[PDB]
Amino acid sequence: ATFEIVNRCSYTVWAAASKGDAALDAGGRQLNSGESWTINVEPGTNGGKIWARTDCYFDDSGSGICKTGDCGGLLRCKRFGRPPTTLAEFSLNQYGKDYIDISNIKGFNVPMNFSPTTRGCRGVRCAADIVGQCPAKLKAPGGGCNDACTVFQTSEYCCTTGKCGPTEYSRFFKRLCPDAFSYVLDKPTTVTCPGSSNYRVTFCPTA
Numbered sequence: 273a274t275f276e277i278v279n280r281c282s283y284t285v286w287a288a289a290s291k292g293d294a295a296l297d298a299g300g301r302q303l304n305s306g307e308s309w310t311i312n313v314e315p316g317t318n319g320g321k322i323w324a325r326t327d328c329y330f331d332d333s334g335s336g337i338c339k340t341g342d343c344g345g346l347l348r349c350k351r352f353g354r355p356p357t358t359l360a361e362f363s364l365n366q367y368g369k370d371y372i373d374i375s376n377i378k379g380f381n382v383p384m385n386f387s388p389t390t391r392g393c394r395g396v397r398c399a400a401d402i403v404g405q406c407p408a409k410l411k412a413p414g415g416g417c418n419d420a421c422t423v424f425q426t427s428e429y430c431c432t433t434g435k436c437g438p439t440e441y442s443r444f445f446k447r448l449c450p451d452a453f454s455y456v457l458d459k460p461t462t463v464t465c466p467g468s469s470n471y472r473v474t475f476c477p478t479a
Contacts, residue, residue, distance in 0.1 A: 273364055274470045276310045276389065277322060279303035281476035285324040285382060288341060288349040289313070296320055299348035302328075303475075315365045315468060322360040323353055324382040324475050326415055339414040340381040355379040356416030358398060358452075360386040360473045370465040374398045374452040376445040380406075381416035385477035393465035398449035399478050407444055419445075431456035 277287045284304050289296035289311055297311035313320060325341035334347035341357045343349035356379025363371045373396060374386055380402040387395025406417035420429040420441035428436050435457075438446070442455035451461050 276472045278308045278474045286328045291320045323357040373462040379419040385474040398452040400448040
């Protein structure tokens with residue numbers, strides 16, 4: 273499957289793509305404002321994610337740091353990134369269909385749109401100014417808006433036992449972005465797409 277990753281933000285981002293225990297394609301790349309990077313994701317990838325990283329430095333070997341979304345200091349991510357990270361999430365070719373969503377369960381850093389480029393389903397978007405409106409207690413000094421699990425580490429926010437409800441913090445994310453997951457047991461906003469669809473992830477879609 274092809275994923276065209278497009279940075280419409282006015283600032284550089286370092287895109288990242290991983291399924292948690294391995295990179296997808298090269299795993300990451302710099303995207304200046306306006307640039308597009310198309311990756312190939314293997315059919316059947318389950319639990320893949322794409323995100324943006326901000327305020328990064330990398331040396332000639334590809335090792336460094338990012339203020340949001342850092343994946344063990346690598347340009348080419350092999351693992352998931354450090355919150356806060358807006359997440360484009362996907363599982364492909366699961367019994368004939370693909371499944372996509374956007375999630376704020378690990379916080380928000382950069383607005384995004386995640387849409388098919390082929391026929392048969394809708395896209396999803398979380399493009400409100402979550403960082404600007406973030407509750408004071410969730411603001412990440414390094415940048416972005418943390419989720420409550422990251423900040424407070426309680427069973428209620430982290431849904432540790434598989435039982436939890438919405439919270440004042442989850443409702444903030446859900447108010448700003450109804451079409452993204454706001455906590456683990458949120459009413460699902462996952463879209464079913466034809467199996468083997470192709471996609472575009474756009475950072476800062478309204479920019």
